[PDB]
Design a protein. Structure first.
Lengths: 98, 98
């Protein structure tokens, strides 16, 4: 089985694709995005290590095709290594993605 | 020799979607990113302050029309103030920009 998944990702892509709207002001742009940004990583001690893996991650799949989006869409993803794994056996192989 | 080497967040706005293009392998993906990302934020006694303002910007740019990054740099980014500045002028300027 598989359902739900409490973790930072929605608010991430949310504020990531805010697009001028929510705030109708200038400084209000980064204002709202700022609140999300903080809620994106919201590091309480995690150095630039976690952050690095933050942007690195989002981009990790961003670079990948819709393959990862297909596995995630139908639910399957769980580990970054796993994701890249599928993309590997994908752009590398050509068979049932396991 | 007093160089300048202008580079606010080019490698950043460039890394954004490095593109899989199979960098020899899967993990290789992060390799490239982790590199850009790493240099994107880069540690330097900069707590979540820089990290935050980091995503805040990248977003403030992704939300704003390149026209901003142009009206500021004319082909890149410079200062979030200058960006939101030009935007403010478009919303309801009042006095010529700096």
């Amino acid at each position: 089985g598989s359902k739900n998944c409490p973790d930072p990702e929605l608010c991430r892509q949310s504020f990531r694709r805010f697009c001028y709207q929510e705030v109708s002001g200038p400084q209000e742009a980064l204002s709202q995005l700022r609140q999300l940004c903080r809620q994106w990583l919201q590091p309480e001690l995690h150095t630039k290590e976690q952050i690095l893996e933050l942007l690195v991650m989002e981009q990790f799949l961003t670079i990948l095709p819709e393959e990862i989006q297909a596995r995630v869409r139908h639910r399957c993803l769980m580990s970054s290594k796993e994701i890249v794994t599928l993309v590997e056996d994908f752009h590398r192989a050509s068979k049932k993605p396991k």
